[PDB]
Amino acid sequence: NREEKILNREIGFAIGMPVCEFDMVKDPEVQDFRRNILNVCKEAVDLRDLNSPHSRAMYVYPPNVESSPELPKHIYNKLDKGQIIVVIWVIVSPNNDKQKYTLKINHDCVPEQVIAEAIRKKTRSGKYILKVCGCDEYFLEKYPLSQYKYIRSCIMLGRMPNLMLMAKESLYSQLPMDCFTMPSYSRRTKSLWVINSALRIKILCATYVNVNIRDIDKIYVRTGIYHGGEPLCDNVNTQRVPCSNPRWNEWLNYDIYIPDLPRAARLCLSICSVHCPLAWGNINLFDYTDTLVSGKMALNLWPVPHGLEDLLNPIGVTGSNPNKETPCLELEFDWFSSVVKFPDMSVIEEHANWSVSREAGFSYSHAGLSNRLARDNELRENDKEQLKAISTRDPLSEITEQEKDFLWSHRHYCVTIPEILPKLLLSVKWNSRDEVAQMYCLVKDWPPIKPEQAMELLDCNYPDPMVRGFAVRCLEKYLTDDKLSQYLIQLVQVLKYEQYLDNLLVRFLLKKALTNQRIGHFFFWHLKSEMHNKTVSQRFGLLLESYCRACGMYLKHLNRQVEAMEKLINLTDILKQEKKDETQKVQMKFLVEQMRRPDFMDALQGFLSPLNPAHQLGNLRLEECRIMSSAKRPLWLNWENPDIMSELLFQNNEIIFKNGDDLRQDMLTLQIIRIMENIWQNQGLDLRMLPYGCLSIGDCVGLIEVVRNSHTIMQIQCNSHTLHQWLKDKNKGEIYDAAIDLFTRSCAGYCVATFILGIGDRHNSNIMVKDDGQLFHIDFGHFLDVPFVLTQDFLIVISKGAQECTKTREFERFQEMCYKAYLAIRQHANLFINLFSMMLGSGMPELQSFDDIAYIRKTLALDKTEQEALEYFMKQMNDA
């Protein structure tokens, strides 16, 4: 058709990849994915069409609400007699005439109740909705007004809520309807258990294996069978062969029997020199149709990632390298006269139910022969008490083989403490179909666990699809849209661990992206920002294709953002190329020259901010745009806020564009800070952090939010009393007390957060202070390594200029904030551990092994008691 060719052009421009390149791939998994995923698209579109048009406005403008309607004490105490003061704005004439009506109402009022009170005091002389003044956020559901994050924050900050009445007809008429069309491209045996053979694989020859004859005599193929990074048997190598003729023609035998192969079994192989590795690759032993791979097949290998001292790379992704001009290794698997598939769930349930009756046969005498079969043995309360103690340890405490045998034995009891499932799963012998079949039935009826606990089951050491299917069940039952957005970074990353294109995790995330457009925005950009990475570009490219067909009109607004970013990349590439050594003035002349060409001049104005799509980026104030003093030439960009009420929120939107630095680390560290702030605010501990906008949009390219009215400590010094005098100066009179209080709280938060996270390299140019006293750190490149950090400059401010701070009462109140903030994060240690664990396959440099993560066990003292952990942080703080 004709409309389909335009839509494919729009999809291709958004992804940076022509749709026809997807059509060219003859891998049937690819084509099946492109068709089979389309039911998620129709379900999502139908969810947006049931109860139109309010259904599609919910989609485009979801409520921005907190997790729970309950308010902490320090929040409620902001509100005398449970009453909030809210200003409601109405425009009487089409000339944008302002009329404010101030209201005093209960915080739990639905937006309809706030419209009623506003319309009654409008007349003192069901057709409207509330909009946040200054940005495209709406209050469409019947949430308690205090539960919306904007209203909650206005209570938190002691700032005045500014809202606007707007008729429903206004918003609805500006939301175009979605005409999702199904595309022209959707319309297109013996079990393993009955095979008693040992596994053997044929390593025949290798091509494109050019390598320097210097320091190379012989080369050889190292293989290994793994299940999620743990070997199922011994690694078997091939025999050394000459470098000029890479032929082995060798069948390798492995200590594992075929019916015991787990579903997620993978062949991890590599080519190694003689005694270093050259290139690696992984193959799934089963395809996406549950078929034991049989026959000849060739694998294009991957270059060794810098830092890989091992010989195999079992955590790297699986599949052939798309660059077919790389080392290519040829393999052959046994055919067994028939198509071999993995047994049905009914066959597994039979074998497992059979296996439980074999237990009651064996009785108590036989139970002695195996420590893992302690089911028949009677269980003292010590056993129940040890299982409880095991279930309460962090996801990275070592589980001994005694404990693993102890866990398998009591699995019918572990169902009663479902939080122990992760450690239980780690106790299975995954190379025993007898045990695994029996674990499946446990997982089949396992009680749901918290989303924060289930996310662990999606990282790099739970590859089994039944384990991961249970994990998605949990998120799909308890994970709120708020928490989904909060954790979206990690949930996108764990898609890389998935063994196949079509899988329950991606169907979950895609459906939520296509029913919640705040989520779909960052879903898009987190995927788009890594299309340059060839290990996942095809995976994310196909997933982006299906998204762009069903997200609706927002595809047009996304392309609008993509070309904006693309012009900024091209323009900054030309600066780093042709004017990199010129003065900043010569660079600015060239910048203003390039920016005033007509094609560029609208590509970058009249689009939505990728940092926050509620923010509209109107006209560009070139007079306020500058190349920044930093290296890599950051662009200070300034747009007009075209909103009618821009003066009540922010009149200019200031964003830094940075080309050259990997921003994934800043984006992650600020996520952790935001979550830590959320934990502290829920426990009534008002420690004000500033998790500040930072989005990676591509390979060492991204956007950074500007916080206004802030200065670095180094500039403020331009005496240890110097900082405090600046704060006294900026904050005279009654403001002094609130300002000192704001600095002490923000300092406590960042002291604790930087200590826990091992945030080193902190100097007076990495710590800024706002005019209202808000301290906050910056440039989070390095992290997880450093001791507790408190300069004398900070302490003088806390004690309001006193000589000894330890002596004053304010330092006592400062410490209790830290100890409480420290113990609050420690009580949520599993959350942060799992979040970092999910980031291991990301390819991020500073999160590549569990050794990198072990440092938060040390700073949080998880192997000690909450007493002795507090004393450790008692000491770490007084060490100054």
Numbering used by the authors: 107 to 231, 248 to 310, 324 to 409, 419 to 862, 873 to 939, 952 to 1046
What's in the article?
They consist of a p110α, β or δ catalytic subunit and a p85 regulatory subunit (further referred to as PI3Kα, PI3Kβ and PI3Kδ), with a broad tissue distribution (p110α, p110β) or enriched in leukocytes (p110δ). PI3Kα phosphorylates PIP2 in the plasma membrane to PtdIns(3,4,5)P3 (or PIP3), which can be converted by 5-phosphatases to PtdIns(3,4)P2. Here we report on the discovery of UCL-TRO-1938 (further referred to as 1938), a small molecule activator of the PI3Kα isoform, a critical effector of growth factor signalling.
We next used a deletion variant of p110α (p110α AA105-1048)30 in which the p85 adaptor-binding domain (AA1-104) and a C-terminal membrane binding motif in the kinase domain (AA1049-1068) were deleted. This construct lacks catalytic activity but, in contrast to wild-type p110α, is stable in the absence of p8530. Co-crystallisation with 1938 did not yield crystals, however, soaking preformed crystals with 1938 revealed density for 1938.
